[PDB]
């Protein structure tokens with residue numbers, strides 16, 4: 001059961017007696033979308049300061065494990081431990097992250113962390129193609145709007161930061177009205193609330209800055225061509241649904257219909273996905289996957305693919321977009337029936353895995369928007385209630401003759417112009 | 431001329447030729463576009479055009 005109390009800070013807890021671990025954490029409603037192009041990467045630097053050697057050493061001496069996660073809409077700082085020592089994690093979180101920040105922002109520590117983060121971002125930008133392609137897709141989809149800033153930070157901006165930027169961001173965003181205290185695993189809600197009440201655990205006053213511009217989607221493309229690479233990596237997307245939309249689960253199911261494909265695994269060549277019937281003959285791709293990502297203001301629905309067949313890219317894109325076209329007009333009931341159970345198993349593993357850190361992140365990110373956490377059972381009935389008419393109604397609105405965003409790198413010379421791709425979003429025979 | 435001057439034998443064979451030659455030009459244009467396809471069109475800058483192509 002999920003129990004949430006608004007006394008003090010918003011305290012959420014999900015109790016699981018079977019687990020042998022307990023996680024206690026703080027989730028902030030600010031993310032990479034709350035920063036600007038001149039201090040971009042301040043959140044990643046804060047994360048790596050919390051994860052620095054001295055802080056991690058003092059934590060691990062007591063027997064605790066530290067996790068930090070940076071995203072568009074939230075920042076997560078989690079302390080995981082054994083069930084008997086769940087009170088010690090609160091003490092470490094109070095003493096280190098909240099009460100005092102002078103020790104963590106010393107000159108030498110800041111310089112070392114800055115040099116390590118610069119090295120990491122430099123390695124990412126050159127030797128991680130499928131993920132940086134998705135980052136550029138975000139950066140070109142939401143350009144000149146908060147949601148397009150990369151979460152790690154750019155190489156040029158990360159140099160200009162000083163400790164003053166970090167402390168300014170901490171003053172502006174680490175607030176009581178922006179925070180949720182989350183408890184996961186083998187702990188009780190009453191015990192957690194009592195433990196918080198015994199201490200003060202006050203973060204700050206409130207009134208975080210309000211953004212003047214809301215995120216917007218622009219049809220656009222960016223091409224980063226490099227002929228010294230062996231493949232071509234391509235990510236393509238349209239505007240999707242945000243969190244708290246009525247069509248959220250319909251979006252995830254429509255994504256699940258096409259699924260993912262790996263050419264080298266024997267089993268995934270026999271899937272009921274009809275798209276493979278066009279792909280398999282000439283080995284058009286090595287792998288693809290479909291995504292329905294949702295944020296607070298907007299979302300992305302699309303796919304990502306990698307291939308060595310540098311002379312047949314347009315055929316791959318054409319067949320994929322013709323499979324997308326089929327959703328509006330001629331989706332069949334068996335497709336939806338398979339999609340329901342595939343999605344239920346897909347959602348089942350996500351929310352019911354052994355690791356409590358994923359549960360903590362999900363619960364903290366959920367209560368910061370909805371105000372409450374949807375149960376597993378009520379999720380299934382909405383999934384089971386989906387019909388063919390709903391899928392057709394959603395697809396006729398979100399992907400029929402709509403603008404797209406594209407991002408590719410590698411031997412993308414075979415990738416045709418924008419308009420030729422944009423015309424594939426309709427059939428013209430219907 | 432088909433004779434000693436321009437008379438009936440001349441015009442009557444000038445027309446039957448006039449109907450034939452356009453079918454020869456149409457065949458030479460096919461051979462004309464075959465030699466255009468091996469290397470492609472040129473550009474006003476007079477330099478290589480293999481760096482920036484559109485369909």
Ligand code: HEM
Nearest residue numbers: 455456458459460462463465466467469470471472473474
């Ligand atoms: C019915 C007659 C003809 C047709 C349909 C025709 C058609 C074409 C076409 C479509 C091209 C490629 C597009 C272009 O360069 O603008 C071309 C190129 C060319 N044609 Fe013709 N052509 C004809 C007659 C001629 C004649 C009479 C000459 C020369 C006396 C000629 C010389 C050329 C040359 C040099 C090019 C290459 C131009 C370039 O690539 O920059 N063509 N022709």
